[PDB]
Design a protein around this ligand. Structure first.
Ligand SMILES: Nc1ncnc2c1ncn2[C@@H]1O[C@H](COP(=O)(O)OP(=O)(O)O)[C@@H](O)[C@H]1O
Ligand code: BEF
Ligand SMILES: [Mg+2]
Lengths: 51, 520
DNA sequence: CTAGTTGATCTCATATCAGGAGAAGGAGCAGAGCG
DNA sequence: CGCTCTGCTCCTTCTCCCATCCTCTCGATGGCTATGAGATCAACTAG
């Protein structure tokens, strides 16, 4: 379960740079590796790579 | 009439019109029908695959073979520029067919779902586009079509594109692909095509990749050790054997003598960057953005596109007679201007290709700066006018140059009225340019053709040329012979941001084949 | 009605040290029945 | 008479917790993740 935006608000700094929450960065890592694992299982990858 | 093995007759007049290899192809299509398999008409561009398909379908309707009595409702999926080319060829070759178009242009003027329904219930040929197959799979697959010919079927080459998943939803066994280049970047594309015509032959993409793609590829890198070369040769032989029954790929060298085609040249000009073009390129390779690319911080695509623009023309920094896209600022346009001058005085018609729409606009402004009469067809020109445009160019010779993007101006269109063709800018994909150059040297070309490929020497373009030579060698390893010379001209690494301006078998044939294969 | 142009939208394709305290598991083992 | 089934102890992890409220300054944070061709389509902008 990925929480809503209220639990991880993207606070705007003095300028326009929108800083993301720690939860959002972590979910970014999770989605990155999840997509990476999904393609590695779908396409050519070694068993140790998938592991 | 000509009669084949079981009950398949093709009319004598329709058959007499064909060539020897085209009737070999009609035969091959019908053995595919008999075995209820699909296949790839891989005859390279211009040999006539529309005619083999139409002749086979006509003989399928005319033979009244036995669910469907004769020919059922078939769908032909093709690039948008050739839907009306297909309709024209059907109406001249086999007029009894009802050939609808499923497109905005179309001819229907009612709900499209109604058109699909009617063609399913009167056994017509529904000619649609890949976009429509993606968009209307809800309706296109509720009707049990009899054939699913995909023209330029290499649009199915990505196993994960939505078009690919859509086209693989037809329940029918009689899947056909027309593509004179059914392998463009790697073997995954071949797997996708064969997974459409016959899902199981090549295995799941897991097995295909591990068994074929990694071996066959790793034996083409320059540094490949001999053992790994021999493994690649063995695996290529196995793959060719496996796909032999379902690929029919004739070239214009086994047919050309039997086809009365004129001579062909394929020169590659190495243009020179101008001093200002060189200065922009040097200041971009020295720019910090390239440094960020080489460190993995930023995406390579941005820098690649910037360099391609620089070699095309310095439209990055737009420098009277200094308007945007002035021809004298780019070396390739200097070469093109000289070539157009000579060819115009030689009374000849040219086919000018470009990967980029912006560069095509620059070349249009350049041609109008000259007095040359031209004609332009990119992805923005309305589809309904594209076949008229082609017809215009082919019919009246006052029009001198035909400005084309390789993506719409390549890919199945017949432009034999053209005589000279210059590929202004290379593409990463070799086959884009193969098909663009084959737009001229086709059945119907009565004059000698020469193709000019413009590369800026020592620039990104030469590297793209090396990439596509490597890809073409990997393709030739598994289409024409498994004994391909290793690509040694480079290691094809991420230093393409550097400017380097120049200056019953009886168990013994079987066992012998096994000892052969294993000894390798 | 008829084309044609123009945005928007979406698909696709290009590359390589000055804690503590308790609770839980595990292991060594002494020993009791007892098969 | 050799195996099992305890169940006691010593050690080892292992994990949790460590007053309340309040004021101020100071340094870092950047995160940036493209591009374009083609097709589709729906709305004007003319006819
Ligand atoms: N046997 C033939 N007789 C007459 N014309 C032919 C024959 N075969 C092909 N053609 C013509 O050659 C042209 C090119 O063939 P086409 O089917 O467009 O090539 P591809 O195989 O690349 O699709 C077509 O316009 C077609 O009319
Ligand atoms: F493959 Be094309 F039809 F020449
Ligand atoms: Mg064709």
């Amino acid at each position: 379960p990925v929480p809503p935006l209220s639990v991880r608000p993207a606070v705007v700094m003095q300028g326009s740079a929108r800083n993301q929450d720690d939860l959002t960065h972590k979910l970014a890592d999770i989605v990155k590796i999840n997509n990476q694992l999904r393609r590695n299982e779908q396409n050519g990858a070694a068993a140790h790579v998938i592991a | 009439d000509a009669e084949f093995d079981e009950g398949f007759k093709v009319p004598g007049f329709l058959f007499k019109k064909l060539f020897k290899y085209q009737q070999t192809g009609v035969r091959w299509l019908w053995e595919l029908h008999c075995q209820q398999a699909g296949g790839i008409l891989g005859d390279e561009m211009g040999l006539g695959k529309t005619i083999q398909i139409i002749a086979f379908l006509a003989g399928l309707s005319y033979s009244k073979i036995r669910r469907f009595e004769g020919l059922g409702p078939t769908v032909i999926v093709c690039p948008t520029t050739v839907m009306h080319q297909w309709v024209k060829e059907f109406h001249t070759w086999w007029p009894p067919f009802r050939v609808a178009i499923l497109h905005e242009t179309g001819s229907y003027t009612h709900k499209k779902e109604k058109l699909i329904r009617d063609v399913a219930h009167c056994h017509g040929i529904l000619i649609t586009s890949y976009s429509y197959i993606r968009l209307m799979q809800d309706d296109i697959s509720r009707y049990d079509w009899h054939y699913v010919i995909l023209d330029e079927g290499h649009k199915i080459r990505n196993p994960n594109a939505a078009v690919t998943l859509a086209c693989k939803q037809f329940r029918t066994p009689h899947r056909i692909i027309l593509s004179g280049s059914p392998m463009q970047n790697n073997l995954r594309e071949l797997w996708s095509l064969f997974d459409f015509i016959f899902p199981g032959k090549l295995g799941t993409l897991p097995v295909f990749m591990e068994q074929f793609s990694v071996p066959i590829t790793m034996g083409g890198y320059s540094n490949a050790s001999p053992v790994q070369v021999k493994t690649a040769y063995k695996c290529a032989c196995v793959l060719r054997d496996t796909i032999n029954p379902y690929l029919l790929r004739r070239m214009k060298s086994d047919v050309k003598m039997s086809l009365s085609l004129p001579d062909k040249n394929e020169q590659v000009l190495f243009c020179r960057l101008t001093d200002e073009q060189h200065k922009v390129y040097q200041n971009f390779v020295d720019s910090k953005e390239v440094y960020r690319i080489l460190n993995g911080e930023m995406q390579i695509f941005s820098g690649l596109i910037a360099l391609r623009k620089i070699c095309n023309h310095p439209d990055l920094f737009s420098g009277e007679e200094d308007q945007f896209g002035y021809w004298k600022r780019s070396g390739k346009m200097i070469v093109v201007e000289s070539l157009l001058k000579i060819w115009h005085k030689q009374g000849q018609r040219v086919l000018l290709f470009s990967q980029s729409r912006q560069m095509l606009d620059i070349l249009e402004v350049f041609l109008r700066a000259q007095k040359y009469t031209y004609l332009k067809m990119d992805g923005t020109t309305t589809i309904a006018s594209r076949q008229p445009l082609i017809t215009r160019y082919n019919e009246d010779t006052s029009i001198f140059v035909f400005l084309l993007t390789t993506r719409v101006g390549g890919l199945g269109v017949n432009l034999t009225g053209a005589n000279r063709v210059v590929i202004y800018d290379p593409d990463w994909n070799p086959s884009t340019d193969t098909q663009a150059r084959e737009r001229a040297w086709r059945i119907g070309q009565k004059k000698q053709v020469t193709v000019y490929r413009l590369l800026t020497a020592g620039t990104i373009e030469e590297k793209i040329y090396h990439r596509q030579i490597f890809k073409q060698f990997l393709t030739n390893r598994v289409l024409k012979d498994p004994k391909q010379r290793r690509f040694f001209k480079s290691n094809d690494l991420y230093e393409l941001f550097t400017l380097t301006s120049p200056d019953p078998l009886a168990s013994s044939s079987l066992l012998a084949k096994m000892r052969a294969r294993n000894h390798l």
